[PDB]
Ligand binder design. Structure first.
Ligand SMILES: CN(O)C(=O)C[C@@H](CCCc1cccc2ccccc12)CP(=O)(O)O
Ligand SMILES: CN(O)C(=O)C[C@@H](CCCc1cccc2ccccc12)CP(=O)(O)O
Ligand SMILES: [Mn+2]
Ligand SMILES: [Mn+2]
Lengths: 410, 410
């Protein structure tokens, strides 16, 4: 019986997590949903509580706390512990009844909850790539202290890589640890990308693309921020750094490859040169489920992959001239220090400016480049609390710098 | 140090095994070649002995024993144990200085040394699919007696399947053991085929194909017998039965798929519907090496897979009208009993008749079908020695029956 908490239970990751839990539990009772946590979606939380009957309920916005307490009286034979805010989140993380926590929260409230799950030696199913990019060294330090805590990757490509590894080796180590790649005999990673909507466009066409071109009738329905990052390939740039931190793979041994069918989710080359890959239809339920069943697998009723129907799988190298965000991500990763923090923060600003029609496509990369060029390496604090404060300071500095560059140009 | 014996060391599997051993040992001294066994290729064995300096040499043909003794006197600082025939093979199998035995002896004959390797509780790297098809239930019985013996598959597709599995699960079972697929969470197998030289021919074109057409300017240089089996797709038919026995996968859960690029070597669908595949250039060194390093991997200097250069991977369903041998193999497998023994034996004859221009393409499947129809199931012996005698008797009966059908129609 797997006891699971879901943080951000009404977002995309949270609802896909509950969907696969529901469907798997029909086949065999495997999961007990112990806690649900949302920002302010009190009615959606009530609907989930009605079905899943968790021991804990938490809502971040305290203005809707009483509104939740009244609604929950409608559910029969049910007396949950209803909590509020950061203190509620912390009480859930500290509960002995919870084994695994799904983090479906974007940005730094995601990092904050991840931190407390780790301090409580839980398994943390983590989808938030920006938290790993911006606080990777901090998370490594925290995981070295809290020896039974584990991050299990949910980002589709990183789940794929993790699924391609031998658990007889994985169990000797854990993600976001030094020497992970040595212990697992990993030589190199093929990190698969959809390529986004702009692969066939010329440099002159890219000059004029808008956020509407990136968002309009998309091949893959996703959130706006990640859709823009897919269009610039900065999504893959961030995922290169995510790969480096999760699996301790050198940047020279991570290759971005454009695979437009999105059936192969990534591939691992081992030291003998044998390559293992993971494949499925594009569907977050498989990566989410594996994060909750690892090191085992369980039965689902998902549609089986029909390779004959798929028929063709294609691969090509991305053009760094057309997708300069990729090069910027490698440069930041290789420089190390807090350059990944700076990359992520400046991209947060540049992405949103492009989304709102304030800058052009190549201005995204120009702004990010200028902020990276302005940053000077800082001595990394040995003290965990000071290190988190450095990450926050540098994140804020980089956002401000990106905004200042935009303001001067405008 | 991994202590290895190579049986049939001058054949294709044996020479590829020594090639990858040589290249891996240059990087780090990991293998000791303890024994080499050949039928009669005395000069080739001498050359291998000069390089690898094995403790044991064995030659099957007693008429070249004295010649081998005199040749070996030329090698400096070297006093091997020089043995002959079946007795020498048995002595090598019983040596406490040998851990792993590569069986590179073809056809029904390779079963004999495989049996003795298992009786001595060795790890047996088995390439010979005909042995597994013709004596599958016998090998299962023998492996249940000799608890510490293991068969590790070398046939490229079966190595691929094995490499796709989690060794944390594999180590709790073994190939040819009941419940192997359940313990490994296997749902279904995609068994990849090149499709062979006749894959795109029309029915009218197929009727006229000759063995010269199959053997001329081949895409892949291989032995004549397997090349004919690739042309008829009986190679994959045999490999379906091999999959069933090795991994305890139901015939309804094995799908043959034509993958003409021969980069993906096969794929495993797990019970959650996630699919894992193994990939490399067509090269027997990877399957052979994995059989000798399992459950670990070691460094090689093999060419890394360039997926962007490969560019395209394709998949389609084979036509059973054009490749009726596939249907015959599934039918024989599903019937069980000694039908696989009969399939293999009758195919041995039909393959050779077509090779030597005595029958046409569709006569191959006609002969096999008629022999299968003629066979009457026998009560399966409980005693392992009686069971082996039964397999031998049925093998001989089926060859003679195939020949008799040919003689009638000729
Ligand atoms: C899904 N995922 O982890 C992404 O990063 C988005 C990525 C893959 C999109 C295709 C895809 C792949 C796997 C699962 C998906 C689930 C929902 C929607 C899309 C899915 C876009 P990119 O490669 O161009 O950077
Ligand atoms: C290699 N192997 O295990 C075969 O059964 C031959 C098979 C695959 C041939 C391609 C291939 C695949 C993998 C390794 C190879 C090594 C040498 C030559 C060819 C290799 C032909 P088929 O699929 O049409 O039945
Ligand atoms: Mn991703
Ligand atoms: Mn094969």
């Amino acid at each position: 019986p797997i006891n699971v908490a879901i943080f951000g239970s009404t977002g995309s990751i949270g609802t896909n997590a509950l969907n696969i839990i529901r469907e798997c539990n029909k086949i065999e009772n495997v999961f007990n949903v112990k806690a649900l946590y949302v920002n302010k979606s009190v009615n959606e939380l009530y609907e989930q509580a009605r079905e899943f009957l968790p021991e804990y309920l938490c809502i971040h916005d305290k203005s809707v706390y009483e509104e939740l307490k009244e609604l929950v009286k409608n559910i029969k034979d049910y007396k949950p512990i209803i909590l509020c805010g950061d203190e509620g989140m912390k009480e859930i993380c500290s509960s002995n009844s919870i084994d695994k926590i799904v983090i479906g929260i974007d940005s730094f409230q995601g990092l904050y909850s991840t931190m407390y799950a780790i301090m409580n030696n839980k398994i943390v199913a983590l989808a938030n790539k920006e938290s790993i990019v911006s606080a990777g060294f901090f998370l490594k330090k925290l995981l070295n202290i809290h020896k039974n805590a584990k991050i299990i990757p949910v980002d589709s490509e990183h789940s794929a890589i993790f699924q391609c590894l031998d658990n007889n080796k994985v169990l000797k180590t854990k993600c976001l640890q030094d020497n992970f790649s040595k212990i697992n005999n990993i030589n190199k990673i093929f990190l698969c990308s959809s390529g986004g909507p702009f692969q066939n466009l010329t440099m002159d066409e890219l000059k004029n693309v808008t956020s509407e071109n990136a968002l309009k009738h998309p091949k893959w329905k996703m959130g706006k921020k990640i859709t823009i990052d897919s269009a610039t390939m900065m999504n893959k740039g961030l995922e290169v750094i995510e790969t480096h931190f999760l699996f301790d793979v050198d940047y020279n041994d991570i290759e971005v490859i454009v695979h437009k069918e999105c059936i192969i989710h990534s591939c691992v080359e081992f030291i003998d040169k044998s390559v293992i890959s993971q494949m499925y239809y594009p569907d977050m339920q498989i990566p989410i489920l594996y994060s909750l069943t690892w090191p085992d697998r369980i039965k689902t009723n998902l549609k089986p992959l029909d390779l004959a129907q798929v028929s063709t799988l294609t691969f090509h190298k991305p053009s760094l001239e057309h997708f300069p965000c990729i090069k910027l991500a490698y440069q930041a990763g290789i420089k190390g220090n807090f350059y990944p923090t700076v990359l992520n923060a400046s991209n947060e600003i540049a992405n949103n400016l492009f989304l709102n029609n304030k800058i052009k496509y190549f201005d995204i990369s120009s702004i990010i480049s200028q902020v990276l060029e302005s940053f000077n390496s800082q001595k990394v604090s040995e003290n965990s609390e000071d290190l988190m404060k450095q990450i926050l300071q540098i994140h804020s500095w980089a956002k401000d710098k990106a905004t200042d560059i935009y303001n001067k140009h405008n």
